[PDB]
Amino acid sequence: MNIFEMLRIDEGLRLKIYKDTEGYYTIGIGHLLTKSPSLNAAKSELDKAIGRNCNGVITKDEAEKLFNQDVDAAVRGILRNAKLKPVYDSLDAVRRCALINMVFQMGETGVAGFTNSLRMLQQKRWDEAAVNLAKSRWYNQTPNRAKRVITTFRTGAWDAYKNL
């Protein structure tokens, strides 16, 4: 298991413009297009992102291209972030993937807001951090995914994703 496989279990693959759990316009492997309510604004963002006239629909290939960019940017954003970098550096390879997953779903900013849990993960207090992470909008809104990520931080192994 690796970051790509993990995220693709959590996000899925859809070749047609669709709405987020949040109601937002997305395509591919969780690539958010716009937070705007117009299908039209989304279509335009889509064509700008791919470099063609897509008419709301992309190929597998195009989806995976978007996915590679998104992953790269998530990692780079962590490395560039003063609050995230030190936690990332402190973690083992598997746990690193759990932080990358949160960033991908919620953005640098959103994760950098989990101050207390970041602190606990740095200290390697795994059980405490897992209880703290659960007390969030994130967990309440997408509990099955949050719980997979959470077990990943708790255990340091890929078991939550074995089932799936």
Side-chain angles (χ1 to χ4, degrees), residues 21-52:
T21 296
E22 257 167 84
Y24 308 127
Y25 287 133
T26 305
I27 197 159
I29 301 138
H31 183 81
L32 173 69
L33 292 153
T34 190
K35 286 198 196 185
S36 162
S38 11
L39 211 226
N40 282 308
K43 244 98 103 69
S44 149
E45 285 295 310
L46 176 67
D47 288 354
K48 182 172 54 88
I50 295 312
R52 73 194 186 57

Side-chain angles (χ1 to χ4, degrees), residues 44-61:
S44 149
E45 285 295 310
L46 176 67
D47 288 354
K48 182 172 54 88
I50 295 312
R52 73 194 186 57
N53 251 66
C54 302
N55 183 37
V57 66
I58 67 168
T59 71
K60 195 164 173 162
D61 238 275

